[PDB]
Design a protein that fits this description.
Helix content: 25-40%
Shape: flat
Protein name: Integrin alpha-IIb light chain, form 2
Largest sheet: none
Distance between the termini: 26 Å
Strand content: under 5%
Radius of gyration: 8 Å
Order of helices and strands: H
Number of helices: 1
């Protein structure tokens, strides 16, 4: 559960898809 939260910080939440 709540894995996405970690999969994000995996690269420093580099997935700033929404942070764009």
């Amino acid at each position: 559960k709540v894995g996405f939260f970690k999969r994000n910080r995996a690269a420093l939440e580099e997935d700033d898809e929404e942070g764009e």
